[PDB]
Structure 1
Amino acid sequence: DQRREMILQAAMQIALAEGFTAMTVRRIATEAQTSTGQVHHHFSSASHLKAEAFLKLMEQLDEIEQTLQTTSQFQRLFILLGAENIDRLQPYLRLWNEAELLIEQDIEIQKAYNLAMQSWHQAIVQSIECGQKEGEFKNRSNSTDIAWRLIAFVCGLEGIYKLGLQGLAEEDFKRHTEAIIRLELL
């Protein structure tokens, strides 16, 4: 019960600091000070454990993001869309990018990555609908459409940065994200 949770917490620590490849059952058992037998008893597979820890860390990232103070949903959206660059979150963002590569070769991470994407979309929907209900955002298009378009934009922009194109500055990410938020909602 709580002992299962402490195994999960050990796995999350390794995930943040060292990534998925380091999260062997042997490693996690040593870090949790338990037996590999009890790790296997509590988790259906090593990949199940990796996916469970990943989802837990993403909810933790959600919690952390919710402690930064905001007075507008405009500010909230910048944080949710990753345009704020909080050094506290960089290991969580490194893990997210790591998980993105594993969805093609790990069935449990594939499902967990999509669950986190759906949660991200819902957090952005809630922010848009709160901003609209509070009179700050306009009602041009429906909130589900805008949320997917915002996610598509920031994911696509990061993808273009990964290419190493000439004459394209990663530093412009915030400026571009602000422009799209403004066009869609202000």
Structure 2
Amino acid sequence: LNREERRETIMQAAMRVALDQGFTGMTVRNIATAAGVAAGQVHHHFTSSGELKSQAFIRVIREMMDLQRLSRTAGWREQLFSALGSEDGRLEPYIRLWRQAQLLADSDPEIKSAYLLTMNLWHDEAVRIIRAGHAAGEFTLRDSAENIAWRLISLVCGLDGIYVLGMPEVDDAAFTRHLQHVIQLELFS
């Protein structure tokens, strides 16, 4: 192996330890084991364990953003929803790590810089679908796509913050009703 394909065989191993056990299990030794490489060789790439868990967390999200890009001929409403509040069981670890990363960003500026970058990735993706739907002629925009993109994200994050507490009146079904509701007020007035 030359130099850079190594970096990937390492990075991808970390991306599963994140999905499997979360940040608290993304120790240099766990990535070294999952990859089948010497533990000392891991320090050779992505110094500062903090980096191989923030730099890895991004790749997990980027993978999440791509595992949701679905049939383009589907209604721009169907696309936007799945890109904001998908209920696929396969994404539970992706969300779990995202929820997890949001807290750690308090006591880990390294994460914070990364969590900030995903919010921009999550935002730049919604803006695309908002603009695209607007250009196609299905979305009616009463405000800039950017403003709409931030407000919907805030709805998801905000509701997730309540859904995790255990509110019965805010569960899967209700988390969907609210979201689909707001989409109508923002794009189908």
Same fold (TM over 0.5): yes
**Residue of structure 1 equivalent to 2:143:** 141
Q: Tell me which residue corresponds to 2:19.
A: 16
Describe the SS at the equivalent of 1:66: coil
Equivalent residue, structure 2, for 1:113: 115
Moved over 6 A (4+): none
The amino acid of 2:90's aligned partner reads R
Q: Which residue of 1 aligns with 2:52?
A: 49
Matched, 1:94 2:96: yes
Per the TM alignment, residue 60 of structure 1 is displaced from its structure 2 partner at its CA by: 0.7
- Write out per-residue CA displacement over residues 42-71 of structure 1, whole angstroms, 9 at most, x where no aligned residue: 112101001111111111111110145651
Deviation of residue 163 (structure 1)? 3.5
| Separation of aligned partners in 1, 2:39 and 2:162 | 42
Q: Which residue identity is paired with 1:119? A: L
Measure the CA separation in 2 of the matches of 1:17 and 1:68: 28
Amino acid at match of 1:169: V
Shift of 1:148: 0.7
Q: Write the distance in 2 (CA, Å) between the matches of 1:139 and 1:13.
A: 39
Could you give the per-residue CA deviations for residues 151-175 of structure 1, whole angstroms, max 9, x where no partner exists?
111111122223344x623121111
Which stretch of structure 1 is more off in the superposition, 110-119 or 68-77? 68-77
* Distance in 2 of aligned mates of 1:20 and 1:40: 17
**Unpaired segments of 5 or more residues in structure 1?**
none
Relative to the length of structure 2, the TM-score reads: 0.92
Aligned residue runs from structure 1 range 75-86, under 5 A: 75-82=78-85, 84-86=86-88
**Distance apart, 1:122 and its partner CA:** 0.8
What is aligned with 2:170?
169
Contact 1:81 1:154 in 2 (8 A): yes
Q: Percent identity?
A: 47
Give the count of matched residue pairs.
184
Q: What is the rounded CA distance, in whole Å, between the counterparts of 2:73 and 2:81 in structure 1?
A: 10
TM-score (norm 1): 0.93
Q: 2:181 aligns with which of 153, 161, 179?
A: 179
Greater Cα shift, 16-25 or 69-78: 69-78
Unpaired segments of 5 or more residues in structure 2? none
Structure 2 CA distance for partners of 1:67 and 1:184, relative to 1, 3 Å = closer
